[PDB]
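Batch manifest line 148
LIGAND: 4-butyl-5-propyl-1,3-selenazol-2-amine
JOB: complex structure
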Amino acid sequence: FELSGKWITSYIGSSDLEKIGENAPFQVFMRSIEFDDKESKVYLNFFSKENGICEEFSLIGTKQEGNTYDVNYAGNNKFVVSYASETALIISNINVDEEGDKTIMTGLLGKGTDIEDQDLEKFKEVTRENGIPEENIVNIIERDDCPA
Ligand SMILES: CCCCc1nc(N)[se]c1CCC
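JOB STATUS: finished
ARTIFACT:
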């Protein structure tokens, strides 16, 4: 069961709409994730937009208790890979920004642009369980025009 490798964002959900719209810090276009269990770290590479222009990031988080990871970006973040199939990952993240406001978010990742409904139904369920309404879900594949 390989979790490390190429991963592209298809959908994102958020308890705070301010964090996931156009040019927001969390409209994230994932490209790859590498879990380094020997050194208890995770490597994240993705694009985001500021001023409507693609910018690339490469972050390094640290593994913490209970399969969770801490990583700094637009504040402090603690996330976990809630679900994993051969075709997708569903990540749950809690962010506390510089102002101290807390936001819970979910993301569905895949190996490309062709979504499997079975994975998508699970993403919606996890999103719902986190108290996030369907109307707070954004289609990222539709918005990802950044470099491969
Ligand atoms: C999984 C969708 C993006 C969530 C997410 N974006 C960041 N930037 Se840090 C965070 C933690 C999960 C890697």
